[PDB]
Amino acid sequence: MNTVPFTSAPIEVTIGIDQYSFNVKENQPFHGIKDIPIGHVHVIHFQHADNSSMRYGYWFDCRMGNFYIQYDPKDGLYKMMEERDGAKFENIVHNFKERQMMVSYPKIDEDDTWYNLTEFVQMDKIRKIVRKDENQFSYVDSSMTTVQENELSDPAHSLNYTVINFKSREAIRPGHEMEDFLDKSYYLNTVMLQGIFKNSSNYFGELQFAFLNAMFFGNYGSSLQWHAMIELICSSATVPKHMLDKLDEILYYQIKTLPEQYSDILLNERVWNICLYSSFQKNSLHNTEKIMENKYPELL
């Protein structure tokens, strides 16, 4: 179990760690988060009490280094940094665990939620969507735009998700215009799965990462990307049976975890109704359809 210490908490802030969150008061004696499960990526995220504008945060994996947070009063945010000196960090964090100035990552033992939400998400793929190679961790906020969003303006701060566009030459073989537009299997299996992603795990990884950035940061282009990747599967007549079964599990936990009061903005009526009721895969998503109907029957 690993630890993300804080030098201090100078400004009042709601801190999130994965799907958990807690409030820290201005100059309250908070030194960090302990007992963070190893083996998963994590995200630590922030919303200042004074300016709820800009949720922001950091994707990280404690296996890739020792990471800590110090408030930068010039840039006005909590910054993640990597501590290179291992012995110093251990002496600093022990010192802190002894004074009990850390919140414990509050994982219930029965609970597989975070695993289920990050099953295919891998730091190495995050770092290709979020390009900042001098850091082992990845900053995301509310306002960052996607490569595709910029095509329709600062490139270094973009989310480099895989561009999906159903009315594009990439998606439509010459002479199979109608076939490929009404059945996207070519685009899914050959262009995207075989060509770009190499396998379904990488595809699901990006899909799950897009969802998490949409949910935790309200990042609109991430929400666009999540829905597009769902729609591309649901609109393909020919999908491997293992992908459909896994897709249903993935979406089930995403819908289960979504805050009830954000469903109005984070869920695209058109995509979901098409996917669950009109698409080729309308009968292949039993778990997701059941949770969607019992929790958001209004959307449908």
């Binding site: 594009s168 109608m178 537009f181």
Partner: protein
């Protein structure tokens, strides 16, 4: 964006544009089978592709053989339309290709956009106008060439005859849409108006009769009356 009453004069500017109407592409007669079920029999159709500035009409005849062994024909018909319009554009010299294609029904937008991906600079536009181009098959010589076709065939017409020698494109289009609206609302009466007078003939190389300027005003007045009338006979006013 969409074409409507507000930007109507754009039709007659010098940017090449085409209207595409697909109403008459997939045409059927519905009938009873021996067993008392219902079946359709397709008849020849056409794509109506019209330059509103010049009157040039690209009439792509859709022979019933193109439906043989196909399913979901009403959906296929929109993609076939889009395929044939794209093939037409590719066949035109670059300086004759449209800058815009306006579809008369919004269900053509995605089919045409997908078929025209190679032409990103050609705008595919809907319209809010309720244009009467479905009545094209009420023009005898157009109906005749469609029904007689034994194979896919493109036939070129000028749907304004020689009117542009004497009137503007705007006025020519208004005449065309009035004639077609009349034919669509009451075909028998509209044709009676157009041919009541034996002395006014249709030139071999024309579609409509050779009216003088004064006779066209009379004709146009009569067509308006017909449209208002039928609007009464329909609504009882």
């Amino acid at each position: 964006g969409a074409m409507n009453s507000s930007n109507y004069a754009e039709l007659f500017n010098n940017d090449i544009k085409l209207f595409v109407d697909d109403t008459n592409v997939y045409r059927v007669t519905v009938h009873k089978t021996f067993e008392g079920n219902v079946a359709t029999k397709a008849i020849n159709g056409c794509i109506f592709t019209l330059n509103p500035k010049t009157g040039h009409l690209f009439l792509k005849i859709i022979h019933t053989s193109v439906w043989a062994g196909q399913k979901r024909l009403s959906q296929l018909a929109k993609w076939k339309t889009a395929e044939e319009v794209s093939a037409l554009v590719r066949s035109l010299p670059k300086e004759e290709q449209p800058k815009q294609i306006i579809v008369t029904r919004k269900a053509m937008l995605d089919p045409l956009e997908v078929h025209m991906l190679d032409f990103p600079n050609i705008a595919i536009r809907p319209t809010e106008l309720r244009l009467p181009f479905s009545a094209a098959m009420s023009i005898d010589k157009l109906s005749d060439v469609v029904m007689k076709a034994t194979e896919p065939q493109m036939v070129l017409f000028n749907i304004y005859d020689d009117w542009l020698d004497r009137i503007s494109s705007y006025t020519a289009f208004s005449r065309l849409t009035l004639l077609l609206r009349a034919l669509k609302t009451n075909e028998e009466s509209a044709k009676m108006i157009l041919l009541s007078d034996p002395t006014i003939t249709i030139k071999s190389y024309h579609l409509w009769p050779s009216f003088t300027d004064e006779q066209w005003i009379t004709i146009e007045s009569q067509m308006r009356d017909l449209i208002l009338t039928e609007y009464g006979r329909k609504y009882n006013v």
